[PDB]
Structures are given as C-alpha cells and as structure tokens.
Amino acid sequence: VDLEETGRVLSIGDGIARVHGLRNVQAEEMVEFSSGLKGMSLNLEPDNVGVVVFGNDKLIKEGDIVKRTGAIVDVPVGEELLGRVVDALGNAIDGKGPIGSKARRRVGLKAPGIIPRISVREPMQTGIKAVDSLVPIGRGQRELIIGDRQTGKTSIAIDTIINQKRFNDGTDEKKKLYCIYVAIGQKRSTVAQLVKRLTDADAMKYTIVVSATASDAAPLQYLAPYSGCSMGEYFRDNGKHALIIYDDLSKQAVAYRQMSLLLRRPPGREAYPGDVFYLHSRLLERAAKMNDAFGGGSLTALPVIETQAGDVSAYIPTNVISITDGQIFLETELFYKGIRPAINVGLSVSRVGSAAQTRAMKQVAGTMKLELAQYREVALDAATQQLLSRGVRLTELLKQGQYSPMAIEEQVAVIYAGVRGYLDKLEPSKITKFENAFLSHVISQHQALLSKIRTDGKISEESDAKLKEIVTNFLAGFE
Amino acid sequence: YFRDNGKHALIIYDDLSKQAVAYRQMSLLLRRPPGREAYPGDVFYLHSRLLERAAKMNDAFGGGSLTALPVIETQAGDVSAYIPTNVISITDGQIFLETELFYKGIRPAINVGLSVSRVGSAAQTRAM
Amino acid sequence: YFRDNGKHALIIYDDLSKQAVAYRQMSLLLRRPPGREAYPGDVFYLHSRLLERAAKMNDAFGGGSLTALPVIETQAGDVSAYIPTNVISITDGQIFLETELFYKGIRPAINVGLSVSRVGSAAQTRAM
Amino acid sequence: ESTTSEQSARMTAMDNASKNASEMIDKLTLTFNRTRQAVITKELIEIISGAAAL
Amino acid sequence: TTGRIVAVIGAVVDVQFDEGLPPILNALEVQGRETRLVLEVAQHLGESTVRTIAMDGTEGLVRGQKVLDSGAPIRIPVGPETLGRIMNVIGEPIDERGPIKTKQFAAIHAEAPEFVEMSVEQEILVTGIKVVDLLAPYAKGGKIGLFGGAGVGKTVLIMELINNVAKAHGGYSVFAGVGERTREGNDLYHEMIESGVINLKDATSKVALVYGQMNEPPGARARVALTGLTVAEYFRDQEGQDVLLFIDNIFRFTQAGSEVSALLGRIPSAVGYQPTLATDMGTMQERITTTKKGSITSVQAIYVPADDLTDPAPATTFAHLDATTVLSRAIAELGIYPAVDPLDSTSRIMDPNIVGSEHYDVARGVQKILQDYKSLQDIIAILGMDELSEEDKLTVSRARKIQRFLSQPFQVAEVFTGHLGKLVPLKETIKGFQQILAGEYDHLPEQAFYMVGPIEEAVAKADKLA
Amino acid sequence: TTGRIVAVIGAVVDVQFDEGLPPILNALEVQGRETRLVLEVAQHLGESTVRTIAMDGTEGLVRGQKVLDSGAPIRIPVGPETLGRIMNVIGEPIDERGPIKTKQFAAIHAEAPEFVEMSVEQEILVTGIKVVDLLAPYAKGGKIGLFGGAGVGKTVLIMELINNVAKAHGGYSVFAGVGERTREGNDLYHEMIESGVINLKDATSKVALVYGQMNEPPGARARVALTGLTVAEYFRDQEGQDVLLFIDNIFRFTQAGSEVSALLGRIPSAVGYQPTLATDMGTMQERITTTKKGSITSVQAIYVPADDLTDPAPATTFAHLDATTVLSRAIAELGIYPAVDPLDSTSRIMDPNIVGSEHYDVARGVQKILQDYKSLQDIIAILGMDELSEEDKLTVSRARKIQRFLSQPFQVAEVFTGHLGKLVPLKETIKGFQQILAGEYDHLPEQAFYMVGPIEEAVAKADKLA
Ligand SMILES: Nc1ncnc2c1ncn2[C@@H]1O[C@H](COP(=O)(O)OP(=O)(O)NP(=O)(O)O)[C@@H](O)[C@H]1O
Ligand SMILES: Nc1ncnc2c1ncn2[C@@H]1O[C@H](COP(=O)(O)OP(=O)(O)NP(=O)(O)O)[C@@H](O)[C@H]1O
Numbered sequence A: 001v002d003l004e005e006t007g008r009v010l011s012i013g014d015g016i017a018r019v020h021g022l023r024n025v026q027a028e029e030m031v032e033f034s035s036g037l038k039g040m041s042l043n044l045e046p047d048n049v050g051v052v053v054f055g056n057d058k059l060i061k062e063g064d065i066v067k068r069t070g071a072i073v074d075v076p077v078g079e080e081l082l083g084r085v086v087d088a089l090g091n092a093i094d095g096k097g098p099i100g101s102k103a104r105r106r107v108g109l110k111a112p113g114i115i116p117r118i119s120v121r122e123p124m125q126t127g128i129k130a131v132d133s134l135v136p137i138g139r140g141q142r143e144l145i146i147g148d149r150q151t152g153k154t155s156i157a158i159d160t161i162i163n164q165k166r167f168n169d170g171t172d173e174k175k176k177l178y179c180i181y182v183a184i185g186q187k188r189s190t191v192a193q194l195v196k197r198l199t200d201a202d203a204m205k206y207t208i209v210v211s212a213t214a215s216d217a218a219p220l221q222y223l224a225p226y227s228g229c230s231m232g233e234y235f236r237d238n239g240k241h242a243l244i245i246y247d248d249l250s251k252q253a254v255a256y257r258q259m260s261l262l263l264r265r266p267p268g269r270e271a272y273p274g275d276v277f278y279l280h281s282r283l284l285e286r287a288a289k290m291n292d293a294f295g296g297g298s299l300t301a302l303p304v305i306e307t308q309a310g311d312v313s314a315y316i317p318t319n320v321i322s323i324t325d326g327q328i329f330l331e332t333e334l335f336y337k338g339i340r341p342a343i344n345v346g347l348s349v350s351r352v353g354s355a356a357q358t359r360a361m362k363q364v365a366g367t368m369k370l371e372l373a374q375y376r377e378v379a380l381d382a383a384t385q386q387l388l389s390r391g392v393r394l395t396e397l398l399k400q401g402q403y404s405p406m407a408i409e410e411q412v413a414v415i416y417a418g419v420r421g422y423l424d425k426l427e428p429s430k431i432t433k434f435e436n437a438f439l440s441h442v443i444s445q446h447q448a449l450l451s452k453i454r455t456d457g458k459i460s461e462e463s464d465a466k467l468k469e470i471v472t473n474f475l476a477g478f479e
Numbered sequence B, C: 001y002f003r004d005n006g007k008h009a010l011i012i013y014d015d016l017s018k019q020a021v022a023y024r025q026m027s028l029l030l031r032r033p034p035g036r037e038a039y040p041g042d043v044f045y046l047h048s049r050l051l052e053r054a055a056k057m058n059d060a061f062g063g064g065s066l067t068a069l070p071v072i073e074t075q076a077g078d079v080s081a082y083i084p085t086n087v088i089s090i091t092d093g094q095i096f097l098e099t100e101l102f103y104k105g106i107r108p109a110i111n112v113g114l115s116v117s118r119v120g121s122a123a124q125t126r127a128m
Numbered sequence D: 001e002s003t004t005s006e007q008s009a010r011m012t013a014m015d016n017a018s019k020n021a022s023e024m025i026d027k028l029t030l031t032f033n034r035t036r037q038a039v040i041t042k043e044l045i046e047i048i049s050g051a052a053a054l
Numbered sequence E, F: 001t002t003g004r005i006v007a008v009i010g011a012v013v014d015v016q017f018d019e020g021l022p023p024i025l026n027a028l029e030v031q032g033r034e035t036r037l038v039l040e041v042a043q044h045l046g047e048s049t050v051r052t053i054a055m056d057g058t059e060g061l062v063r064g065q066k067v068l069d070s071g072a073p074i075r076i077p078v079g080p081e082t083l084g085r086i087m088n089v090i091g092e093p094i095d096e097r098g099p100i101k102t103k104q105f106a107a108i109h110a111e112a113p114e115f116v117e118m119s120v121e122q123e124i125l126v127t128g129i130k131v132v133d134l135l136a137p138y139a140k141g142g143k144i145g146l147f148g149g150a151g152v153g154k155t156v157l158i159m160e161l162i163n164n165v166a167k168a169h170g171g172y173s174v175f176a177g178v179g180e181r182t183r184e185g186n187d188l189y190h191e192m193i194e195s196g197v198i199n200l201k202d203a204t205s206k207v208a209l210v211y212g213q214m215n216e217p218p219g220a221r222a223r224v225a226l227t228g229l230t231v232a233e234y235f236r237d238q239e240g241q242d243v244l245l246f247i248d249n250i251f252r253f254t255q256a257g258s259e260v261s262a263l264l265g266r267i268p269s270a271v272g273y274q275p276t277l278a279t280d281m282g283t284m285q286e287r288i289t290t291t292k293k294g295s296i297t298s299v300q301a302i303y304v305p306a307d308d309l310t311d312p313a314p315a316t317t318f319a320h321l322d323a324t325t326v327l328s329r330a331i332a333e334l335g336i337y338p339a340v341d342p343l344d345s346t347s348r349i350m351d352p353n354i355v356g357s358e359h360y361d362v363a364r365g366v367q368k369i370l371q372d373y374k375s376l377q378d379i380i381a382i383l384g385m386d387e388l389s390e391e392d393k394l395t396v397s398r399a400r401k402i403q404r405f406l407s408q409p410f411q412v413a414e415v416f417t418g419h420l421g422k423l424v425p426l427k428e429t430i431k432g433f434q435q436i437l438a439g440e441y442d443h444l445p446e447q448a449f450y451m452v453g454p455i456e457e458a459v460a461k462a463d464k465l466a
C-alpha cells in the first residue's frame, strides 16, 4: 500500500530500474528489491526513481516491489573482515559464514581536508629492491602501478602485501600495516589463486579482499573500490595504517563507461563520460596521512592502471597520473628481456616518498640512482666505460623473483656490495648468483650487523667498516 | 532457379557498397539506431543472408550451383572499414585490386600477394 | 555604408574561428542538432553570407568597395581541416602562416606555395 | 685497408638505419591505430549527438 | 501465459502480456509459424511490454500474433546424445538425423561458478603435442588464443586436440561455430566424419557441434557460444570431465554482441563497440573454468581487426587468455606440422612455480637456442656455414634438430599421409628436448628428428637410414 | 519565499517555488542539513521551477525537502581577515581557526572590468628562470599560463615561481587550489607557515588561500576559481595594490563544468564538453586582470588532457594569456627540466622595443637554431649524425648545447635533480646563450651545459670533466 517507503518497478532494461513511489528516499540511499538484490537511488525525478542495480537485473521485473533501507549506501567495516573474501557490498564469498561486523561506513565519504593531514614520513616497505630504493613509498601516499597487460603489475602489489608479515608478527603497533586488495574486472580464478597465495604466505590473516570480477555486473565493479576504501578508512581514522590496492582502475573506468553510456550520458574522449576523472580523484584522495591530532593513522593506495602498448599519454592513464603522487611504470620490453621487476626507472617517480625512506637505504641508494642515471645516457674511453660496467651490474642487483620480499636491511646489504664497487670485476651473468650466495651468508653468519642496521635505521661508521670487511672477505671467497 | 534445377549460375553484385548505402538510408529515416559509419546493426545480416544463398548443391538436390562475385568499393585502401570488413569476412576469399599496380602497368591490377581463394586447388584442373 | 556611397573600406574579422564557436554555442542551446564537429549544418553559410558582402561596386552603383581580411586559426598547422577549408572555399585566396617558417626567420611567416590570390595581377600596379 | 674499413662501416651504418627504421615503423603503427580508433569513435559520437538532439 | 506482438522492427520484437511478465533472458515461442521462432526477452519497457531479440527472421509477423512465454531461458538438449550431432542456437538438430534424444535439458544462461567453487591450483592440460606442451602449454580450465586462418593445418590441429583430450583425459569436446560460414560448417562436418572424431554408425563421437551461421540474426549469433558452452557444462558438472570447448570465432561473438546492442538503441562505446563489451565477454568467459567437479578448457580462434592488438575486441579478449597458439604460414612452408610458431606462441603458466623448474628451463633453453639460431641466419647467408665457431656450429646443428623434433604426426591425419599418429606424454616431451640440448644426439642426422613422436623414434629412424 | 526540491541528479537539483522565484545566480540554502548546502540557480525551467547546481554532496536529499532563497549570489569574506586563512568555495573557513570576521562580503559572481578599465602598460617580470626570461618572458601584471600534461612539471614550476617572485613581493598574494591534490594544499600551507608568509599569531600574513580540490563535487570545483578570484579582486581594487594570483589548476574549472553540463540538459559540443565552454571561460578569465585601478599578476597552471593541446579546454585558454609556458612530456623524458617547449612558448612582450634588441636577437637566434635542429631530426633518426654536412653537424651540436643550457635546477625540485637550485639574472641568461650562439664553446662537451645556472658554471663543469 505504502508509496513513501516503498515503490514498484516501472521498467528495467539498461541496468537501471525506474521506480514509481519511494516518495521518501534520499539521493544515494540503498534500496532493496523483493528478489534480495540491493540498489542505489541515483536519479530522483518528479515521477520516478532511477535505481542503479548492484547485481543481475534479469532478477528484476516490472511490478517488483522495492523498499527503502533508510541508509545512504554503506558497507560493513572493521577488523572482522581481516582474512575474509567479500564482494562489493561486504557480503562474504569465501563460505566461512557471516562477518561479525559491528561498525558500518558510507562508501561515498569525502576525503580528509587540508588540516587533518601531514606529509608522508613512515616507510611503506614493499620488500622490492627496485621500489624501496628508487621509488620509495610513504604511508598515506598514492603510487600508481602502471603498464601493459602481463608486465608484473599485480606482483608488485602481492609482494608488498606479503612483505608486511615481518612487521605484523612483531609487537610494534606503529610498524604494522593492514592490507586490502580490491579485485575489479579480474578473472575469479585469478582472485581465488591470489588468496591461496596469501594464505600459503600466511599474509591473508591481515588482509581484506574485495571482489567484483569479470562476470559481476558493472555497478558492482564500479562500487568495489569505494567499498574497500571505506574499510581502509576505518584503520586510517583509528590510529592505524592500511594499504589498499585497486586492481585495476582501468577495468573500473570501463564498467563506469558502460553505466554512463547505458544512462545516455554524452560520451567524450574514448567514449568516456566527463566525470571519469572525478570517479578516480574522489576515491584516491581518501588515501591520506593523518597528523598526530587525528590519530596519526594513514591509508596508502596502489591503484593499478593497464596501458595499451605502453601509451601513458592516453586519457585514463594521464587522469590517474594526475591524481597520484608518482608512478611505477612497468615496461613490456624490459619484462620480455627478463628484467624483472620490469621497472622503467626514468619514467618512474615517487613525488613524496623520499622523506619516508630509511636513512640506511638513502646512504646506498642516492649514489645508485646517480650511477643508473649516468648509465642510460650511454645505453671506449676509461671514464665512460666504468659507467657501463657499473650500470649492467646494478641492473642485475635490482632483478628480483616473486614471493621473496626482502627486509629493508637485507636490501641495503645487497645494494652496498654494488655501489661500493665490489662487483666491478665479476662478470654480469654471475651477479644474480653472487647476490643469493652473499645474502644467505650475511643472514646466517652475521645476524648482529643486520639487526643493528634495522635498529639504528642507519649505517654507522662502525657498520660501514664491518660491512666492508664481510663483502671483501666473501668476494675473495666466492668462486 | 538455375541452382535448384541441376544447372549452374554466376551472379555479380555490382556493387554491395551502394546497396548498403541504400539500406542505411532507409534504417536511418525509419529512425532505427545508427552504429559505426551510421550503419544499422542488421547490415552484416543483410549481406550474410544474401551471400550464403550461393551454394554447391549435392547430387540428391540436382548438383546445381550458384557462384557469387560480390563487388565492394574501398575508400583509400581501407579494407578495415565497416562494410568491407563485413563482406570480406562473409566471403570465401578476395581479389584485391590496387591503383598503384594499375599505373605500374600491372593490369589486371590484382595484388597476388594479398588475394586469396580459400577453396583453392579444389577448383583447379590438373593442367593449371 | 562606405561600399555603397562611393567610398572604400577594409574590414578585418579577428577571428572567425571564435565567431563559429559562439554560433555553435548559440545553435546548440537553441536545440538545433549538431553537425560535423558539433558545429551547425549551416556553418559554411554563416561565413559565406558575411564574406560575400565584401564586394567591388560598378560605377552605376557608385564605384565603392568593401575588402575583407578574415582570420582563421588552425590547430597544429592543418589548413586542410574542415572549418579552414570552409573559409578558404569562400574567400578570394588565403595567406597561410606557419610557425616553422616563423622560427626559421621567414617573417612574415608566409608559406608561398600554399597561399594564393585569386585576383592576381589585376590587383597590382603595372610596376609591381 | 680502405675498402675493408668502408664495407664494414657501410654494413654497420645500414644495419643501424634498418634498425632505426624498424622502430619508427612500430611507433608510427601505434600512432596510426590510435588515430584509427579516434576517427571511428569521433565519427560515431557526431552521429549519436545528432540523433539524440531530434 | 500468452502475450501479443505490439511492434516488429527487424530483429527486435515487442510483446505485451496481460498478466505476469517473462523475466529478462526468457525464451518466447511465437505462434502460427512454419518453423520455430524464439524471442529472447531483453528489457522490460514498462506498460506490461517486453523488448525481445529474435533468434530467426521476423518476416511475416503481425501485430497481435500470439507469443507463449516458455517460463525459462533458452533450454537445449544436453548429454552424450548431442555428440556427433549438429545443433543450432536454440537446440534444434540441423544435421537432418532426426531428434536429439537426451533425458536432460539445460538453460543457456547460467552464472559463473562461485568463488568457493573455484580451483585454487593451476594445472597443465597435457595435449600430447610437443610444441604446445613444452613451450606454450595449455592450462586446465583456461582459454587459448588460436591465431591462424586457412591453410595452416588449423582444422587438423582442432580435430587432433579433440582426439588427444579424449585419449589422455577422457574428456569430450564441443565446437561452437559463432558466425559459421555454411560452406565451411559442412566441410568441417565431413572432415570430422572422415577423421573419426564424429561417427555416424556407432557412438564413438568425441565432439558435439553447435553452429550459429553467418546468415542468422545478430541475437542468434550472439547466443550460440552460450549454447555450445552449456553443452560443455553438462560434461563438466554432471560427468566430471576435463572438457574442451572450441569457439570459432571469438571476434564474431563480440561483433554479434555489438550488433544486438546497436539494435536495442544502446549508445556505442569506443571504436563503435557495445558499451557492455567487457561484461558480455566476462559473463561468458568466466563460465569457462576449473570447478571442484571438473573443468572446461576453451580454444578460441581470434581475428584481430585491422591487425590492431589494442582494438577493444582483442584487448578485451586478451584479459581472459591464459595461452596463445600461433599457427604460422611460414612454419607450414618449411614442412613443420603442426605449424605452431614456437617463439610467437606464449603461455601464462610457463612458470616454474606452476610447471616445475625442469619443464621451465628446457623450454627456455629451447626458446633461447631457436632465438640464437635466427641471429646467426644473417651470417649464414654471408659467411657460409663453415666459418662459424665450434660452439656456433653446434648451436645451428642442435637448433635445426629441435625445429624438426617439434613437428609431430597426427592420428587424425593418418588417412591423408599413411604415417602413424603420435601422442607424446609430457615427461617424454621434456626428456626428448632435454637431451638434444645436452648434445646427446649431435652425432645423429638432422632428418631423423622430423615427423617423429618420442625421442626413441628419432633413434629408430636414424638407425633405419642406410 | 520557500521552495521544495522536486528533482535530484548528482550535483544538479531542481527546486519549485510557490510565490517568489529566485533569480539566476542566487544562492539557495537547503533546509534540514548538518552542514551548509548551497545551491546556485542556473536556470528558470518554467512552471515555477528553477534548476540549480549544488556546492556540496547531494546524498541524503529527499523530494519535498525545503530550500530558502538567500536573496543574493554566493557571497564570501573579503579583505585583510582572509590573509593567512584557508576558505572553501562558499567562504567558510576550512583551517579550524574559527570565523573569518570581515567587514565586507563580496559576491563570487561579478562582471568583467569594462574596456575603459584596461591597462596597456608592459614591463618584464624577471623570474630568474632561463628559458622563460629569454624566450617567453613574463610581464608585471600580466596573465601567465603554464600548460602541461600529467606529471610534466606544472606544480613544481608554479611553486618555484612562488619562491622566485612572491618571496620578494611588497603586496598580497592569493592561492586558489582548483581541482588539485588536497595533500598539495597541506604541503603549501605548512610550507608557508615555516617561511612566515603565513603567520598564525601576527597579522603579517601576505597570502590568502582558497581551496576546492579533486575531492569536491563538480559544482564546488566549477566555482572555487570564482571564489579565489573574488578574494584577489578586493585586493586589486579596495587597496589599489599589486596582487599575485596563483591558480592550480584552472583546467579543473572547465572539466567541472563539463561534469554537470549533461545534467543541465545541454546538447554536448566537441569531445563531450559543454556547449558553453568558451563563454564560461571568458566570463571567468576576463575578471582575472590588471586594471587602471590595480595590478594582478596571474599565474595559472593548465592541465592538458591526454597530452592533447588541441583539446577544446587548453586550446581555448591560449587567447586568455599574455605569456604561455608550454611544458612537454617528450622534453621531460629527455631529462630536460623545466620541460619547457622553447618553440611553443610565447610572450606578448617578446618585442625589441620592450625587451631591447639584444635580448630579442639572442632569443630569435636560439629559436632559429632549435628550429633548424628540429628540421634535421628525421634524417638523424634514420641515418644518424654521420650523413650530415659539416654545417649541419655544427647546428646540431650548438642546438643540443643550447637545449641543455635551457634546463635549470630548481630550489623546489632539489630532491629530484640532486643539484642545488639556481636563479640566473636576466643579463647573464642573455650572455650565456649569446656566447653559445657565437661559437664560443663549440670545444666544450654537451653534458657541461646540463643542469647549471650561469654560463660560468657550464665552463667550470667542463673543467671538472677532466
Ligand atoms: N619478479 C618476477 N620474476 C619473475 N616472473 C614474474 C615476476 N613478477 C611477475 N612475474 C610473472 O609475470 C606474469 C605476469 O605478472 P602479473 O603480476 O600478473 O602482471 P600483470 O600486469 O598484473 N598481469 P595481468 O593483470 O594479467 O595483465 C606472471 O605469470 C608472473 O609469473
Ligand atoms: N623543474 C623540475 N626539476 C626536476 N624534476 C621535476 C621538475 N618538474 C617536475 N619534475 C618531476 O616531475 C614530477 C611531477 O612534477 P609536478 O610539478 O607535480 O608536475 P605536474 O604537471 O604538476 N603533475 P600533475 O599535477 O599530476 O599533472 C616531480 O615529482 C619531479 O619528479
């Protein structure tokens, strides 16, 4: 009977339901269909409500009853989601029962303004030699990961999640990082395989996985980043640190374009709507570093963007570059040649992470950045011959496998050997072999020196002499 | 009529480019939705159903045949434009003509590198 | 007024690129459906009717004249684009300037082969 | 000595010119296909906007 | 219930119902026709009116003509009885061999296997074809991009995959001809009959055939892939098989989607594709996967419009591919069959974390040597062969031997050649190529490795030659 | 009197009024909200309904919700009390420092100074930045625009200008964040507190801050420019003063307008933009000006979507500028910073009668040698250096040294350069390039000219290369 808290479907067809009644709904309020499907009040018009359906609109028919929920679109939030795989709405999909969630939070919340923030200053350690040294990330930073299909984009994110176990198993609460992986448009098998990988690494226990995959309806793919972001903001505001991965925003923008076109919004460049930048800007602004007065927490975002044939000049790629605080560009050419991670150093930046790089890394990395800069400029005199000799060797040092993220001190020990010239006499094909032999040696025999570097956060005059000792002793002991 | 009565027929459609234009006129003015190059969604179907009517009948059906040679006009060599794409993909092969071969003195201006019959040897005599 | 009272006038339209944009805005807001590049269908006519009023009158009509120098702004040097060719196709020739020439020190940066006067020596003194 | 040095250097110059050309080809192909896609999309949007305004 | 036609505009038909409306995706049977005319509900327009997409011609339809709501989506005969039979989009036999006598029916629209129903592990689906399994191996429940066209042994490769999957995995196959050219569907039919993978006499048939032909309306051509996939889903869900699903060809699936979308008045996206390009592709591809019960592995022939890999159609498709098999006309001309390009063909699971370190390093070693052999081919035509170093003479030898050991006689091609077909196990494939690299068969003549199965037959062929 | 919301779609809200209809541009106040929600009247739709644009989120609005006419357009605090304070689009403080207690309020909509109000005087503003001062020099009280695609250096360049120009300025400044990063605002604010241009205890603050960043809905981003500009207008006129106005990023105004334009029921223009792009920009830009009454020196960062300078938004901005600095991604990728395109950046005062013939000649000379180099680059890319005449090799070598000497280490970018920031006086800029052109350093290596200040530093760098 009631047309104030209830409506009836007039038409349904382009993923949008037009609803009669609902005279009392708020704009952006979640509504519920008789079939169990949730929707969002989008369009409030004199004679109808346009509702975005969060699911398969084959299940909705003309006549179907629709009820208000009274709630602006929100999602379940809090620490109970840790270890869970959920969909775009927060519904569990791992078959491990309901989420014992107590709190809830709107998906559309505006980002912190100017005052609550402070510049990033806490290291967000990836464990990836090339990133942690050349493109350091800070907690509260936004760093785009960008490149063609199959360039190792997701792997950068995964090794970063896995890396946090070292901090998350200790007692120091400041150094802990909770993780959120948002899967948008991906294959469901890829996601299932991914949580498997995180489980094996015992990384899943501190991870929320939000999943709107290739067969999930476009509005579910659109929603999913905001949902995971909300879950991330829970930590950001409660004095904790979270990391979120949007994998990927290219597939999200596609989904949004589908919705916008079906809504008959005027298409623009690449048939995208005019608000496709705002789509990503509002989301990524929500990754922030809070000052002490607002708890000191932070949310770090790693949006993933997929380029076509390395074209970073395209509309969506430039949109996101123009939002984040730098980018890690992964090149097909480098990946092909087996240079992995396939990071193009020249096209990569962290605009704000420098201040959040541990001093111990700065001492070895600042001269490596310089020696790599001198190297690309000469891609047979003794002066410029040393530049090519050093460059190829550092290139080998930054090569890294998957699922073996390194402690920051391990990385500096390895990079120390390179930047002080202890590799210059070795053949390039033997650098990878040297590193793995040199690494498990300093781990086994010299725990004190590494433990000291981590605690000091520096390489002291004492450590520098002790490190020189070991490297020279090992080099003459390496065959 | 010939195909169905144990006889063989050749048909030239000269050209299907112009036919498509004519149908586009009609769909647009009937206010059917425009797609690429303002062509409607049933234009592939239009041509596919015309060209599938060329056939080699089996002996139970008289053994007759209809062979079709559709003609398509390209614009500045763009075989990837909409109607060419459709008819290229529908047919069993293409004889590509080129202006630059033509004036080089290669006449008929057939590009032998690009032209193809997917039937092939099956349609040649042993001598040839 | 000068043209029709045995006097001579010169008019510069600086520039008709911006007037076409203004007219496009106006036409779209009047709900007149957009055409090529969102300009109205009659955007040629917008300028053709304007520039045709530049004219030389015979002695019976007073012998006066209006001379026009419309200005068009290209994008990335494309004189061959639509709006430019519209206006080029109206006037009695065009002076095409290029940045490449400009920076090379050819100033005025006139591209000779691409510029034309359609009146030619009839418009020059015998000496020139 | 001279033609032994010349035929090496011309072999190398021609090697480098062929490799440069090959890169310029791949680059211009990518440009062509970006322009190909834009022309198609632009042309469609012009059509859509005209139809919608009726 | 029963509705009436209120509008017909080409392949789009509007039906008004007096009581309950058929939900979207329901099949509707038009009454008063010579043959069956199925209409699939696409939208609820309001005012008790649905918009449908016709599965055949709408010539002759009257406003008012009665239309029966079937109550469900398009449901087709599924089961072992469809094998060796040809059906169309709506389940009808089109092979003139009478009714398809199945106990079960299945709706062609179904949702992808849920997240809990997913296999967390990646497995190779061994084909027994040396090039494939060694260098660009197939993944159980994955999708493979087949680049080829005519004359490159494509139909033979397909027919052999059908055969080898039945022989090695006990899996049946489904072939879905999306935009099948009628002529080629007939020829394909008889080639299968001639090769044995279809058998009209007994019941050994290994493939079921589903044709959505070129001259059919957009809707019909857009749905056949689902029809085929549904047939295949029976064998996974009900009989626990590692199934094979061929889609010929995926681009035409995309284009039919583009056409349907255009016909429903939906504003086209970039390059004129349907706004739902990715979801159309997503809701079909995600059905192809390994469940706890079994798997469907799909081989999908790919047309790349304008040779642009960045075109929305192939771009979207590539997101779903786990491997590519590239058939090369250059390779076939060298007499190498199957005509697989060993350097152009790739696989996502060529990863030691998946296939093992030994499979990996041998494949890489093979790739490396075939890469190296090419580098020396410019020096071959210039310096000649007897100017190379003792290391470089040996790489040329080994690479030439590797090229030939990658060729394989097919069982499905026995009639054409007389030569006995081979299905090489994965471990014998790895072993074989492992030993050529080591230099264990440098003394052997090069032609001994050609058109051979396991490495033991390379030895038996070498002994046989004078 | 009092109106009722009849429609809501994103930022666009229709309101029905029973008696009095609020004029276009009026600020309406939405009743029953926790935070102030302003709607600005955009259109009279007829039937006593107006169409409006919200200055904040519209989540939570219900049809029938009451709205009151404020009786005027959005009005904001202006005067001394704005200095050191941060305000938003509607003039609320956003720095948690309590009310901004001003005597005057000014409406954010106003008409552009008339023709007779214009200033025709031209005077160089020397920036200490080599490429700018030489090739496309800025003018005191002039309009300056910094064009660049994503990540190429717009904000760095504007911050270095604040460093190089604002620091030693005896007037007031206004910084308007428009659709940029909120953390950038946080950076700017705390940096200004560290330096003391903003003082949290004194009344010695010289900069007023206005922010409506990329976290704001379109209505807010579409109007913050007008707000920031209004603050500047007060200072120009009601103090007759020298005012600096920095806007980052003015493109975001046009993009914002674009997001709401469809919802306002306009037929779209080229590339989906609003049909009103040029006039919207005109009415806004024409207010950003020096008048007889006072000087505004304006610097506007201008984002260029998809690196396309012919895009309607940047394309339309050019004619609003007295000096353009066009940044180039290709120049940046070569490591040249600031990534200024020395052949696409222009200044209305690059005139021998204004800058003197020496400055003018060196500039034209540099530009000619760079253009000559550019014309040779097709030949160079295929065949290489070696196929050039000796005359061409000299142009190439001089041009390449000139390209490098156009680069400069910024104090603001020291982390990225690894060099100490430099400021080159104009006379020394002219001399350095005058000398390279004269052939005076044809003996010195390229690298010596890269990332240095004055020409002497290039020499000393050449010596250090031993
Ligand atoms: N450091 C590494 N060393 C060796 N192999 C790697 C490394 N990182 C990634 N890979 C491999 O490269 C492939 C692609 O990496 P992935 O992380 O999926 O990149 P992507 O761009 O996210 N792929 P997609 O999302 O499917 O386009 C995977 O199959 C990995 O096995
Ligand atoms: N003058 C410079 N010297 C050295 N590096 C620079 C300079 N300008 C820019 N960069 C580099 O480029 C990055 C982007 O600079 P920025 O000034 O933020 O560009 P932008 O055009 O404002 N980017 P966006 O706002 O995202 O479109 C910086 O973090 C530096 O790494």
Ligand SMILES: O=c1c(O)c(-c2ccc(O)c(O)c2)oc2cc(O)cc(O)c12
Pocket (backbone or CB within 6 Å): A268, A269, A270, A271, C036, C037, C038, D037, D038, D041, D042, D045, D046, E270, E271, F269, F270, F271, F272
């Ligand atoms: O650059 C582009 C462009 O300008 C236009 C466009 C659209 C409508 C018009 O009326 C017009 O003049 C241009 O569409 C595009 C579509 C793309 O997919 C990619 C692009 O890069 C453009």
Ligand SMILES: [Mg+2]
Pocket (backbone or CB within 6 Å): A153, A154, A155, A247
């Ligand atoms: Mg990935």
Ligand SMILES: [Mg+2]
Pocket (backbone or CB within 6 Å): F154, F155, F156, F180, F248
């Ligand atoms: Mg910026």
